[PDB]
């Protein structure tokens, strides 16, 4: 869990890029 930081970013990466997972 983290309560910090826990700001969906994915979610506006999803609709913003169409790519598959990347680390």
């Known amino acids: 869990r983290a ?3 826990k700001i969906p970013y994915n979610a506006i ?4 890029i ?4 990347k680390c």
Do not use: D, M
């Not at 990466?13 to 913003?16: C, I, L, P, V």
């Not at 169409?18 to 997972?21: D, V």
């Open 18 to 21: 169409i790519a598959p997972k």
């Open 3 to 5: 309560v910090i930081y």
């Open 13 to 16: 990466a999803s609709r913003w």
